[PDB]
Structure 1
Amino acid sequence: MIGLVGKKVGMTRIFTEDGVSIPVTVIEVEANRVTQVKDLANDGYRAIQVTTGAKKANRVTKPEAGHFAKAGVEAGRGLWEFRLAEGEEFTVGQSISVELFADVKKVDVTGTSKGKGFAGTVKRWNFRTQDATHGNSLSHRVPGSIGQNQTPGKVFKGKKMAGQMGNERVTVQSLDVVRVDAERNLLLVKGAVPGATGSDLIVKPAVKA
């Protein structure tokens, strides 16, 4: 089944009547108007393309507006693509709302993680800090040794040292749903999702059986 695109309102809690304080993430999912439908004849594969949100009419470029005018679809804030499975079908310009998730149980959430910039080996790979005392000099949070001697005489590919945190796509799998409400265009999931408040997300049904 195809997924949707939502925006992270933030986080809150839901108080079940039995007494469980479920932590819940509120994902604003405005209805995804379909901008493009692809098939096997000219693309060689089956996928649809949606948009959501509202962009400024001046800032949308002429090729971007030409794509939206062809689809008969008002301009959104972005474009995303979902492959269809066997048996699914969609038409260009049709809308898809929250109510697709009114019967699914587990969903997968995809987003770009919170960027943290250059971070050390202690944070990037949970390297244990050396002795803060007992003679130790200028080497507390350094990664220490990085390789062996003359054989091999080199550092292997994929070796863990410091680098860039965040700002990459990360999928969290098998999150339970709590509420579906197209009257508020909302969606409720137990747990935490990547990204900050107001970020972009992709919500798909879980492939994890």
Structure 2
Amino acid sequence: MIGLVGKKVGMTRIFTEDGVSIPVTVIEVEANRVTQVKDLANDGYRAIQVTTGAKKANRVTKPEAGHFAKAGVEAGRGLWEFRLAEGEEFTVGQSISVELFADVKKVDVTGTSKGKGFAGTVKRWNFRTQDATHGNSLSHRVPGSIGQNQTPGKVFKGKKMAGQMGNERVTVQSLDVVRVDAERNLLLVKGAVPGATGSDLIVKPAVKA
């Protein structure tokens, strides 16, 4: 089934009557407006392309403005696609809101993880550190050996070493839906989801069943 695009409002808890604290991530999902519909005949696959939010008209470029004009929808802050199952069809300009998840009870959330920057091998790959004392000289957090002797004579593809960590697309699967609140445009899911506060999230019904 299709999903929606939301925004990570933040994190809080829900207190249940039996005395259990549920850590919840709050995703504000406004109406998602179908901007395009793609089918086998024209595009070779079935999908619906939606937008959400709003953006100031003074920097919607003319190509984007023209694209939104065909659908007759208000310009949003981005565009995202969702593959269609065999059953559902949507129409251009249709508005999809949060009660899609009224009875889903398990969602996957995709976001862009917080960017850690150029991280070393210890933080990036859980490398053991070397001795802090006992004669160790200038090698406390360094990666150690990176290969064998002459026989390979080369470092293998995919070797774990320092580099950029974070700021990449991450999906967390099978998150419980604590509640769906239609009038406030809110989804409360149990647990933590990728990304900093105020970033875009893609919520889909759980595929892992």
TM range (shorter): over 0.9
1:161-201, CA deviations, whole angstroms, 9 ceiling, x for partnerless residues? Answer: 00001111010000000110111000000000000000010
Superposed structure 1 runs of 4+ greater than 4 Å apart: none
1:63 Cα offset (Å): 0.2
TM-score by length of 2: 0.99
Q: What is the rounded CA distance, in whole Å, between the counterparts of 1:157 and 1:44 in structure 2? A: 35
C-alpha separation in 1, matches of 2:188 and 2:86: 28
Tell me, in whole angstroms, the C-alpha distance in 2 between the residues paired with 1:6 and 1:74: 17
Cα RMSD, aligned residues only = 0.4
Query: Once the two structures are aligned, what percentage of the paired residues are identical?
Result: 100
CA distance in 2, matches of 1:117, 1:8: 21
State whether structure 2 residue 151 is matched by structure 1 residue 151. Answer: yes
Equivalent residue for 2:160?
160
Once the two structures are superposed, the pairs formed by residues 48-59 of structure 1 within 5 Å of their partners are: 48-59=48-59
Structure 2 CA distance, aligned partners of 1:55 and 1:122?
41
Superposed displacement of residue 49, structure 1: 0.3
Q: Distance in 2 between matches of 1:72 and 1:112?
A: 30
In the TM superposition, residue 6 of structure 1 has moved relative to its aligned partner by: 0.3
Counterpart CA distance in 1 for 2:33 and 2:27 is: 17
For residue 194 of structure 1, give the secondary structure of its aligned residue in structure 2: coil
Secondary structure of 1:124's partner? helix
TM-score by length of 1: 0.99
How far 1:76 moved relative to its partner? 0.2
How far residue 203 of structure 1 moved from its aligned partner, in angstroms, is: 0.1
Aligned partner of residue 147 in structure 2, secondary structure: coil
Give secondary structure in 2 for the equivalent of 1:41: helix
The unaligned stretches of length 5 or more in structure 1 are none
Gaps of 5+ in 2: none
CA shift for structure 1 position 105 = 1.3
Query: What is the rounded CA distance, in whole Å, between the counterparts of 1:176 and 1:67 in structure 2?
Result: 36
- Report the count of equivalent residues: 209
Query: What's the CA shift for 1:128?
Result: 0.6
Quote how far apart the aligned CAs of 1:13 are: 0.5
Distance 1:71 1:100 in 2: 21
Does 2:20 match 1:20? yes
